[PDB]
Each structure stands twice: as structure tokens, then as C-alpha cells.
């Protein structure tokens, strides 16, 4: 999970934001 | 090299990203706290002496 850029969790861990984790 | 270089790092350079920090005492590139211009070493030193104001042994 945490290692997957295309999950939401992958994003969190990576600190990033994107399609798979939007800013509200 | 550490003389020709304490000198070079003060010169304003072509491109600001060639720029960098240096312990203004102990003339040194690495672990250089920007709030002081001070190398972790030449710093623990002053911090001990009382020559860094309000700075104190943290203990919590």
C-alpha cells in the first residue's frame, strides 16, 4: 500500500497530493 | 584547500545556486546552522561558554 503512488496511502506517506489524493 | 575556499564562498558568484553556508569561525561547509552561521562544533563550544545569548542546555 504505502509504496504505491496510485493509492491515497502511497501519497500520504510520500507527503504528495494528486488525483489519487486531492486537497479537499 | 580550506583558505582559498573560505574566501571563494564569500565572493558573490555567477548563479546564486553555486552559493553556500560556512561556520564563520572553524571555517566549515557541513552541519552549519543558518540561525548562527555556526558549525555544530564551533557552536557547542560557544553555547557552553555563555557567548550565545539565551541558549541553554535543553532537558525535558
Amino acid at each position: 500500500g504505502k509504496g504505491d503512488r496510485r493509492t491515497r496511502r502511497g501519497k500520504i506517506w510520500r507527503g504528495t497530493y494528486g488525483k489519487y489524493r486531492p486537497r479537499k | 584547500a580550506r583558505k582559498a575556499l573560505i574566501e571563494k564562498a564569500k565572493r558573490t558568484p555567477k548563479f546564486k545556486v553555486r552559493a553556500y553556508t560556512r561556520c564563520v569561525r572553524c571555517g566549515r561547509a557541513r552541519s552549519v546552522y543558518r540561525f548562527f552561521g555556526l558549525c555544530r562544533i564551533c557552536l557547542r563550544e560557544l553555547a557552553h561558554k555563555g557567548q550565545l545569548p539565551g541558549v541553554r542546555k535543553a532537558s525535558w
Binding site: - | 540561525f35 557547542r44 545569548p53 541558549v55 542546555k57 535543553a58
Partner: protein, 98 residues
Amino acid sequence: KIRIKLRGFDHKTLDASAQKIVEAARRSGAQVSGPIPLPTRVRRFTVIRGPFKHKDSREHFELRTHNRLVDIINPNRKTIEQLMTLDLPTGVEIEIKT
């Protein structure tokens, strides 16, 4: 109407310096919302003790900016005398606002 922020590294030279600004406005004027102590900004620095490799083993330093606040509501000129230049700043900061 008048607002004064007080910074400083030393907590005795605020609870002193700015608790004497409570007498130099109460005696020579009107109302004061007493000295109010603010959240302090702790800075912590963490240093490898030795000059060369001993990466576990460190020393821990903080640098603690204490903040205090005072508010005076009625601007007399009987007050802005001590509160103008009857000077005892020492190692203290002075912010003056309205």
C-alpha cells in the same frame, strides 16, 4: 487602546521589566488589562557532541523566546512619561501597537 508586546530570552527580565510597567501606568493614569503571559517559542538545536563520527551521543540545546503582553485602555499624558523614555531596557524587546 494601547497594546505592548514584550519578547526576551530571560523570564526574570520580563516578569520584572514589564511588571514595573504596571505600576508606571496604574499610579500615573487609568485602566490596565494586566500583564498576560504568551506562548513561548522554544527553538531546540541538536548537535553531535564530538567533532568526528560519534553519531549516537548528542547534546541538546534550546533557545527560549518568552513573550508577554500588556494593554492600557486610557491614553493620558501623565502616563506617557515613564512609558516614553524613563528607560530600564536591559535584554528585552518592545513592541508598541494601537
